[PDB]
Every structure is written in structure tokens, then in C-alpha cells.
Design a protein around this ligand. Structure first.
Ligand code: FAD
Ligand code: FAD
Lengths: 401, 401
């Protein structure tokens, strides 16, 4: 079952979390990790946050010490694997044998087809190399155009504004954060960014560019010194597709991390997996999934009596003055608003319910509320809804009971 | 790999096709099939066609003779399987061991929530028992309401009209056959059914029923003696879900039929699988998939050097005077129309193209054209488009080259 040796493809958070848990759970056989980036394994959330602002990569490295006795092959690309021969072919000419193969190859930013032939700087933001490149161009008083109103684009928008960069942002949807964020939150976030000087353009798409100017589908133009594209990511599932695994913008896995190919597992951003709240398959794109799924899959490989992955989804986003936390589903049949929604010292909580049951929550500048809410969410709590609204209620108390 | 004994759950077309191919390919070990219906294995397409009209079940049985030495446990339900112990638990108290388990459990009609408490006859049409029940109520001059404008509902509509039954039909979409049928075809099919006296209601939904009358979301009413619901099907994937396989209204499989659980395969209507034309996962609901996927999975189990399943999708529908055949994708960036689209002796061909490449085709009352078109489709042919339109063109000739 858990057959030595273990080979992991990818050296990001999911991989690091997985191999650390293998060691902690007691597996003592060979572990080899293949990572295409020639970088000490590092975390991505700082790249649109404090790193973008302060530039010290030695503050963003992952801790690989709970993963002793691991050989990390950095700067090397896995080119294919043969699931019958149980081997992986590497770009440096070597071949690795495996008893258990783990695909943890993440996802890459989608390119914008209309900017393919652009003759102005166009970047995406995924890697440390990307961040360094973008930061090198965030000159004060320059003009940045961001395509996409997802959390990363908005984090970059805030960082750029703090650095004195003019920011315009184009979003095809009528709201920001259309993926997994309640409308109430998205509306407020737009007001916040607008108030900080971001030039927001909703229901607009990029049709092209000419000589340093981007063209939109309303027949208008936006001049910029740099474009950063952030319209989402695509799973890095090429090796899986070529080897005959079930994939569709993401490798399908069950709660044990199993792919359709025996002895091959997958975890993190590369997977398409069950969301336990919706009961539907989804490609989750969060830090917490990468870590939690990696840990759960490793734990069950070492101890098959352990449960499969069962964590509920959540993420956070740091956008200037807004410390945003979102858990569960973006909507149900009811939203309860705790506190006032205001640009004057923003601080509020949203709770999403379905037939009385909590299915999602949001905290803006209230980390203290978020932990109790995630606990209530996990057990599908059906609390008194006036109390949920009633500011006099302590959520931590509710959760303890 | 192909490990004896083989157990198949479900005794429909996919199962029969699979076990026949196992035998033909040379596998001589045990095969046991568990089928919940107490019926000699039978084909479903006649149920809304000639069977609905003539009632002889001995004309619709599947041929199990290319499947010698198979024990068919008819009238028995598989209640669970234990993929670690490699056993299946049966409703009759017995347990079957397996080396290879194959899930071929099909799909069941979706119920209409708004008719849950109905006090008038409400039926769905999937089984021989369903067909016999519906036919028993198709009294001449009675009123039938069909909910759903899919092919089965339309086949029943035509059959009922031929039998002198008044037919009304309610469809939530603005067109019939919204799944995998070109708009040009759907528009024509509506004209045909309207001309035959079907009372079609588009962009309407059922909100409820009271004392023999169905309520619609435009505030109106339709009286009927019987309702037949045909709004689609849901995969019978409960055993797979309970055992920890990856599922989402369908068991995920690769081109070898492998699920995420080692030694467990799935085929037919129960699977969610790659459509090679769209490159996306889809639950295919066709006779040709059930047979073709069953054969391909069996072939590769016996001979692992054989390719995985690779057939392109297609189906047919018999609706009164219309013999409809549809292959591939419903749309591309171009449609070519061969012949005139007319209610006077209907006979035409549609061809769908994407950047010059054939990606779909339709034939109405022209079986001769359909075979060559499927061949051109399979090789992604890029023929001269005037010739494709030019009535002087022989498609069979084009395909041979
Ligand atoms: C700028 C940014 C900000 C983010 N902010 C947040 C946040 O605040 N909160 C949050 O919840 N999430 C955030 N995320 C998301 C989060 O970081 C991801 O969910 C996480 O990185 C996924 O980890 P992973 O290990 O699955 O994939 P990855 O981090 O992508 O790691 C995969 C690695 O495998 C490599 N690889 C791919 N193919 C091969 C191959 N053939 N051979 C060898 N190596 C290969 C990749 O290049 C990559 O290094 C952010 C992401 C970015 C980019
Ligand atoms: C009325 C009708 C008309 C159709 N017309 C056409 C057509 O003209 N053209 C076309 O392309 N397709 C048509 N189809 C579709 C086609 O018949 C299906 O695609 C095909 O039946 C799928 O075969 P299957 O073996 O995968 O599933 P099924 O035929 O559903 O067989 C599965 C069997 O497994 C049984 N089962 C489920 N769970 C268990 C269990 N736990 N234990 C034991 N047994 C179980 C089921 O009850 C069922 O008997 C039609 C279908 C219907 C119903």
C-alpha cells in the first residue's frame, strides 16, 4: 500500500506538508522530492503581500525540518512517469524508481489570449521570480493595469497603491472575487479599493493592446507601464494526462488522495476533489487545502485506519487595511450580518446559512470571531439566528457548547 | 491486474457488453453479474419506441450468448462492497468475493421536487416496469403531460400521439433537447411536434399540482390524466460513494475504466469520463457509450496492450416520422446545412465545424450520410466547405479518401 520508495513531484506547500507528515507519522523509507524551481521551498501568500513590499525571500521559506532525511532535487523537472515500470524521467537525464508516486505540481496562471502578442510588459504573479520581476517595475507614479478582480490581483492592487503606483483594474464579472466570496463582501471590497484610488472597471474585457495601451471591449483604452494578468490558474496536470490518469483541469482524487492509477496519488492545487459542503467536485486553490490535504493523505498512507481528508475549505486575503477571512460556502438561503459594514474602521462578520445551518462565514478585521465560526461550520451548527445577529453574543461560547 | 474472479454490478447493456467482450477476448475465469431487476437483460431504447407501441418484451432482450459461462443473479441488489476485503454484500444475504469489481449500475430518472406529494399519476420512464405502467395508461383521448423536452420525453410524445393520446409538454429551457443537440435541429423538432398536435410550453416550470391539475410558474394550469417526468437522470453511484471512490453524480473513470479504488472499474451511464472532442469530463447517457465503453474496458483488461476507450459520442432518437442521428459536438464556429429543412418529407444533414475541422454532425432521415460523417469526425477531417454544402458531393467518397 504505502510502498517505498516515495517520490513526490513538486516542492511547494502541499509537497512539504505531505513529506513532513510522512516522517512525523513514522514512515522511515526513502523520500525524494523533485522541484522544478531552483529555490529553497517557499510559501506563496507573501508574494502579493509583505514580500512584494519588503523583498526578503529569507522570510518566506517553508520549514523542512519536520521532514528529515528527504532528498530535494531542486531545479529539476519531471518530464514523464511510467506507471507500469514505476519510474519517473527527469530533465537532468536521471530516472527515479517509486513504490508510491505523489503528484503535487500545483497550478499556473492562465494566459490572456488577447495579450499574446503584446509589446509592453505583461506579467503573471505565481512564483518568487514573478514577484521579483513585478516589484522591479512598481516605480512610484507609474501606471499598473491589473486584469482580473480575484484576491491576488486585489492584494497586488493594495500593495501597489501603498507604494505610490497608480492602479487600474479590469474585471469581466460585475463584481470582484466572484469565486467563493459572498456578494456583501465583494461589494464592500470594491468600495474600499475605489476609496484608495483604484480605478475599477466592471463588466469589461481586454480585446488587445497596441504600443503600450490596452484595448477594452467597450471600445476604449487604458494606458499602462505594466499589465499584470490574474484571471485564475490552470492545474499542472500534464504528466498525469500523458500517463492516462483521469484529469480535467485538475487530477481527480478521492479523500485518500488516490488518482485513477494505482500507486499514484495527488494533492494540493493540482487536484480536483470533493468539497464536503457542496458535495461537488472542485479544484480548490487555497493554502489551507495544500497543507491540510497533504497532511491527511500522508497520515492515511502511513496509517490506513486514519480517516480520509475531511477539512472544510477556507482562505484569507490581506488587502491593505482589510484582513479578510472566508470559510465555507459564499452563499446559502440566508446571510446574517454582525456589526456594521463601513469604511470607517472596517470590522464585521457575515454568516451564511442553509435551512438554519451554518454553511459559510466571513470576518473582516476580526480574527477572534473566525475560529469559533469555523468550528460551528464544521459541525453544521444550527444556532439561534437572533443571537447570531445579537452583538451581545459570544461566538466562542456558542462553539464550546 | 485482470484478477479473477470478476464481479459486475448491474445487468444492463454496459454489463452485458463488458462480459461478452471478456469472453470473446479469451478470459476464462469466473464471471458473476448482479442485477437488481428481475428481468432477462434487456435494451432500453425500445421502451419509448416500438415497445411502448406493441408491448412484446421478448423483442427487446439483450443477447447474452457471446457471454457463455456467466452466472446472472437477477432480482438481487448489491448493498455494499468492501474494497479491502474484496467482497460484495448482496440483498439475499450472500457475499461474493472478487479479484476485479466492475460497477455498471447505470442511472435513474431525477424526481421533480414540486410533484413529490402529488395525488395524480406521476411516472418516470427508465425500466420495463415503468414502460408497462405508462402504456397501461395511454388510453386514446386521454391527456398526458410530459415534463422535460429531452429525447425520451419527445419519443414518448410521438408514441402517445400515434396512439391517440393528447399530449402537452413543459420545458424549462427555451428549446427542446438542450443537451447535445444543435439548435437548428431542436428548432425543427419543435415545429414537427407542434404540427403533430403536441402542446409545447417553453420557458415554463412546474410549481406543483392539485386534484389532477399541474401548476406552472406563469401562474397557469394544465389538466392531465397522467404526468411523465423526464428531466434527466442521476448516476447510480451510491455504492461507490459509500466505499470511498471519487464521484460527483457519476463515478470518475479514466480511459481504462479505472476508478480511484484499485481493482474497481466502472462503465456506462454510471460514469463521468473524458469526452475526447471537448476534452472535458462528462456523464455520457447513450446506448453507444454503454456498449463501446464496456467493450473497450473489457478488451484492455484482458489485453493491457490494447488502447483505452477512444470512441467519439453519438446517439439516435426515433420521434414519429423523424429518424434523428447526432454525433459529436452540438456546436462549433460553423454549421453547414445539407438539404432543405422542411416538414414536407423531412430529410437533411447538419455539419458542425471548428476552425474548418468537423466536430459534429446530424442526420434526419438520412442514415446513409451518417456513417461517412462519423468517420470524417473521427479523424478530425477538414474538408472543402462548399463541397460539404454542395449537394453534388458524395460523403462516402470523401470518407474513403
Ligand atoms: C501570489 C499568491 C498569493 C496567495 N495568497 C494566498 C493566501 O493569502 N491565502 C490562501 O489561502 N492561498 C493563497 N495563495 C494560494 C496558495 O499559495 C496555493 O494554494 C498553494 O501554493 C498550493 O500549493 P501546491 O503545493 O499545491 O502548489 P504549488 O505551490 O504551485 O507548488 C507546485 C510546485 O510544483 C512545481 N512543478 C510543476 N510541475 C513540475 C514538474 N513536472 N516537475 C517538477 N516540479 C513541478 C511547480 O512549479 C511548483 O513549484 C496564494 C498564491 C499566490 C501565487
Ligand atoms: C426509455 C429510454 C430510451 C432510450 N433511448 C435511447 C436511444 O434511442 N439511443 C441512445 O443512444 N440511448 C438511449 N437510451 C439510453 C440507454 O439506454 C442508456 O445509455 C443505457 O441503458 C445505459 O446502460 P447501462 O448498462 O450503463 O445502465 P442501465 O441500463 O441503467 O443498467 C444498469 C442496471 O444496474 C442496475 N443496478 C443499479 N444499482 C444496482 C445495484 N446496487 N445492484 C444491482 N443492480 C443495480 C440498474 O437497476 C440497472 O438494471 C434510452 C434510455 C431509456 C431509459
Amino acid at each position: 500500500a504505502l510502498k517505498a520508495p516515495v517520490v513526490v513531484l513538486g516542492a511547494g506547500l502541499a509537497s512539504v506538508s505531505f513529506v513532513a507528515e510522512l516522517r512525523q507519522a513514522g514512515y522511515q523509507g526513502l523520500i525524494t522530492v523533485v522541484g522544478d524551481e531552483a529555490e529553497r521551498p517557499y510559501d506563496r501568500p507573501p508574494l502579493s503581500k509583505d514580500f512584494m513590499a519588503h523583498g526578503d525571500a529569507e522570510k518566506i521559506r517553508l520549514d523542512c525540518k519536520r521532514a528529515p532525511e528527504v532528498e530535494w532535487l531542486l531545479g529539476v523537472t519531471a518530464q514523464s512517469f511510467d506507471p507500469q515500470a514505476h519510474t519517473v524521467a527527469l530533465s537532468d537525464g536521471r530516472t527515479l524508481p517509486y513504490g508510491t508516486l505523489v503528484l503535487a505540481t500545483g497550478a499556473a496562471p492562465r494566459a490572456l489570449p488577447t495579450l499574446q502578442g503584446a509589446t509592453m510588459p505583461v506579467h503573471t504573479l505565481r512564483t518568487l521570480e514573478d514577484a521579483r520581476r513585478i516589484q522591479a517595475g512598481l516605480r512610484p507614479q507609474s501606471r499598473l493595469l491589473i486584469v482580473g478582480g480575484g484576491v491576488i490581483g486585489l492584494e497586488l492592487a493594495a500593495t501597489a497603491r501603498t507604494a505610490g503606483v497608480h492602479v487600474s483594474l479590469v474585471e469581466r464579472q460585475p463584481r470582484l472575487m466572484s469565486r467563493a466570496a459572498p456578494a456583501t463582501l465583494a461589494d464592500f471590497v470594491a468600495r474600499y479599493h475605489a476609496a484608495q484610488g483604484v480605478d475599477l472597471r466592471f463588466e469589461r474585457s481586454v480585446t488587445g493592446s497596441v504600443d503600450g495601451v490596452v484595448l477594452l471591449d467597450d471600445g476604449t483604452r487604458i494606458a499602462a507601464d505594466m499589465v499584470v494578468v490574474g484571471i485564475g490558474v490552470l492545474a499542472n496536470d500534464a504528466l498525469a494526462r500523458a500517463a492516462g490518469l483521469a484529469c480535467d483541469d485538475g487530477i481527480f482524487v478521492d479523500a485518500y488522495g488516490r488518482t485513477t492509477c494505482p500507486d499514484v496519488y495527488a494533492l494540493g492545487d493540482v487536484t480536483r476533489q470533493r468539497n464536503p459542503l457542496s458535495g461537488r467536485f472542485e479544484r480548490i486553490e487555497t493554502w489551507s487545502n495544500a497543507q491540510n490535504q497533504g497532511i491527511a493523505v500522508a497520515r492515511h498512507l502511513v496509517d490506513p485506519t486514519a480517516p480520509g481528508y475531511a477539512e472544510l475549505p477556507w482562505y484569507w486575503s490581506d488587502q491593505g487595511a482589510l484582513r479578510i477571512q472566508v470559510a465555507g460556502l459564499a452563499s446559502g438561503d440566508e446571510e446574517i450580518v454582525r456589526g456594521e459594514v463601513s469604511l470607517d474602521a472596517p470590522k464585521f462578520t457575515l454568516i451564511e446559512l442553509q435551512k438554519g445551518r451554518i454553511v459559510g462565514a466571513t470576518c473582516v478585521n476580526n480574527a477572534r470571531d473566525f475560529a469559533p465560526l469555523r468550528r460551528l461550520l464544521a459541525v453544521g451548527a444550527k444556532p439561534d439566528r437572533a443571537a447570531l445577529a445579537d452583538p451581545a453574543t459570544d461566538l466562542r461560547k456558542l462553539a464550546a457548547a
